[PDB]
């Protein structure tokens, strides 16, 4: 689970502006935090198929959002994935 402080820090860091809470860039940043933590869990917990179910959802959610961003703008898309460290 994700703390409100880490959540709000993600919001502030990826916001387009101070009241943006839901742009696709903020959404993929939130999902990237979740995917990173859950990958570390599943590397240690291969039999946690319940948690693995969540990963496949989260990876798909981010895949759809990044594909949406990429055809709004490749400049914003490339900058965003570079910040998040996604190849």
């Amino acid at each position: 689970a994700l703390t409100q402080e880490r959540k709000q820090e993600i919001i502030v860091n990826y916001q387009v502006h101070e009241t943006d809470t839901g742009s696709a860039d903020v959404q993929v940043a939130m999902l990237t935090e979740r995917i990173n933590r859950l990958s570390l869990h599943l590397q240690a917990n291969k039999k946690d198929h319940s948690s693995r179910r969540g990963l496949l959802k989260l990876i798909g959610q981010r895949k759809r959002l990044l594909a949406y961003i990429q055809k709004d703008s490749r400049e914003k898309y490339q900058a965003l994935i570079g910040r998040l460290g996604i190849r």
Binding site: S39, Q43, H49, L55, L56, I59, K63
Partner: protein, 602 residues
């Protein structure tokens, strides 16, 4: 069916178990995986599928350069040989499956072409129905194997009248019929064949044998990829998911010892039977078995000692032990795998080799087969093969002095027919065939006797355990179980009851039905009905008769047939195959099954 398996736990100190586990998991199973990969890429692979046969030596040839590859080099000679046998039998299995499926697809595709309705047969013959009926009466009078003979007659007879007459004659089960064709029952029967062709076509897209990766390196690298990389499209992400859901293989492939003397038996000073394997004699394993099997493991030592006392003038061709499989059974709980899992030896024996009379049966079977071989076989190593065969043929004459038990004698005119059904798994009729009289019926309830309550237990547990799995799946709970072992128990109880009744009436044989593939018949029948009832509504079609289709997929007619065949062979009762009639009750089906198998003796 005189080959059976007996098993024992193998016990040894930890360093022996660890060394064997590492040989199996780190070298032998990776070698098997590599052989499966290379064999599936071989340029002759596509012609092996057409022959349905693997070359006798191609796995051995592929393994030779791998025996000194740093990935695989550390193994005894018999472990390489075991890996070869594993891989060779896998493809012998898989190529035989694909070959038969292809023949089924070709056979039914021809039938779909020659299945024409009388409205179509009128046009395609150019003759009135009475005219083709007469021509079918002539062609039947010549073809008098009848089915195959008509299928032979069809192909090269390009004369559309005779060709249509054969089509009409085959539509009716190789016979004349006066009655009119019900056009909707024909259209349904045509549709069944299309579904069967489609389902055969889909089954022929089987995967190549997948192997056992025990490291699961592909899973972890895919996890790192899918979490840090953008998927190029949906199909890459789907392939990632398909890998991430794939479950890890825990256990290596077992070892196979096709030379019975590669298991060397001994008794330790604490009096326990012990075994070691060729190439691993430093690892002594202690035999821990039930007394109900101990007499076999004692026999393995006595057979070994007999041939040593005779300075190898006996043949191991008559050793009661045939081969061994060395298996790790999955342990519950946690530990290092050589501690967690339990090492188990499975020995094939031929039950006839227990007695002296049965050994004489095997000796003649061996002698005839080897005398045939030596005559037909006639290089230096091929001449050495002849000399080994001639040594076997000489040495099988030396007796092991085994227990004498006179062979079963059954009356040729007394048969037991066993009717198999979805509702009543077995029903038997003892028939005196020259008298044409039933000596005894038994129902399923009389066969099970006091065990009959197990049959309601099975139905009740199959319902209950399916529903508990359904509930557990939604929670991702691992606690998913089923009644397969109870079902196996019931089929073995029935098999013993049937054979005991056969012995009691001195039946010469047990008659079993040629059911064919009941599941593909039922599945294509129900689909053809459902497509009429739910046109354009696939989920309605799949809901239709769902529980009947499930019941037919659970019907264990093969396991019951196999259990009967094994028990009859262990008492020397002949098994015969007959055709079960569709008419009548299970009792009448069993009687007419028995009597038809008697009349089919030619």
């Amino acid at each position: 069916s005189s080959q059976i398996t007996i098993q024992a736990r193998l016990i040894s100190f930890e360093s022996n178990r660890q060394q064997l586990w590492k040989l199996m998991a780190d070298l032998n199973t990776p070698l098997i995986n590599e052989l499966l990969c290379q064999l599936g890429q071989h340029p002759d692979f596509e012609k092996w599928q057409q022959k349905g046969k693997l070359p006798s030596t191609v796995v051995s040839q592929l393994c030779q350069p791998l025996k000194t590859d740093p990935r695989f080099a550390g193994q005894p000679s018999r472990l390489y040989m075991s890996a070869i046998h594993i891989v060779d039998y896998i493809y012998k299995s898989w190529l035989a499956i694909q070959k038969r499926l292809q023949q089924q697809l070709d056979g039914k595709t021809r039938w779909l072409e020659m299945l024409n309705s009388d409205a179509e047969l009128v046009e395609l013959s150019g003759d009135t129905l009475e005219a083709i009926r007469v021509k079918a009466a002539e062609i039947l009078a010549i073809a008098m194997s009848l089915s195959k003979t008509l299928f032979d007659a069809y192909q090269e007879t390009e004369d559309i009248k005779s060709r249509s007459a054969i089509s009409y004659l085959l539509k009716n089960g190789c016979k004349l019929t006066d009655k009119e064709e019900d056009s909707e029952k024909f259209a349904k029967r045509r549709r069944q064949v299309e579904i069967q062709i489609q389902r055969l076509t889909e089954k022929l897209i089987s995967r190549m044998p997948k192997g056992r990766d025990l490291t699961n390196a592909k899973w972890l690298e895919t996890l790192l990829t899918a979490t840090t990389t953008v998927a190029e499209d949906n199909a890459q992400a789907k392939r990632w998911q398909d890998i991430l859901l794939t479950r890890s293989s825990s256990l290596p492939f077992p070892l196979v010892f096709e030379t019975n003397e590669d298991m060397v038996w001994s008794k330790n000073q604490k009096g326990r039977l012990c075994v070691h394997f060729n190439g691993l004699s430093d690892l002594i394993f202690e035999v821990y078995c039930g007394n109900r099997q101990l007499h076999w493991f004692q026999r393995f030592l006595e057979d070994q000692q007999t041939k040593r006392k005779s300075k190898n003038q006996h043949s191991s061709g008559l050793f009661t032990l045939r081969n061994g499989h060395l298996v790790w059974l999955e342990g519950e709980g946690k530990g290092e795998p050589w501690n967690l899992h339990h090492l188990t030896l499975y020995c094939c024996v031929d039950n006839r080799l227990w007695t002296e009379e049965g050994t004489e049966i095997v000796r003649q079977e061996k002698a005839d087969e080897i005398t045939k071989f030596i005559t037909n076989m006639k290089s230096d190593t091929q001449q050495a093969l002849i000399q080994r065969k001639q040594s076997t043929l000489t040495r099988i004459n030396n007796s092991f002095e085994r227990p004498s038990q006179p062979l079963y004698q059954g009356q040729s005119h007394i048969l037991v027919g066993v009717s198999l059904g979805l509702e009543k798994p077995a029903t038997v009729a003892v028939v005196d065939a020259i008298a044409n009289k039933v000596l005894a019926y038994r129902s399923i309830k009389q066969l099970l006797g006091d065990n009959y309550e197990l049959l309601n237990r099975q139905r009740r547990q199959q319902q209950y355990l399916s529903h508990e799995r359904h509930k557990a799946q939604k929670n991702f709970s691992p606690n998913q179980f089923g009644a397969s072992e109870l079902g196996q128990h019931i089929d073995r109880l029935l098999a013993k009851a049937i054979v005991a009744l056969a012995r009691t009436y001195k039946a010469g044989s047990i008659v079993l039905p040629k059911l064919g593939d009941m599941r593909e018949v039922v599945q294509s029948e129900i689909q053809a009905i459902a497509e009429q009832k739910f046109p354009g509504y696939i989920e309605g079609q799949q809901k239709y008769a769902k529980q009947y289709r499930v019941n037919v997929h659970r019907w264990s007619y093969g396991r019951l047939i196999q259990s009967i065949q094994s028990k009859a062979a262990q008492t020397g009762i002949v098994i015969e195959e007959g055709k079960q009639p569709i008419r009548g009750s299970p009792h009448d089906k069993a009687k007419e099954l028995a009597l038809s198998a008697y009349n089919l003796r030619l």
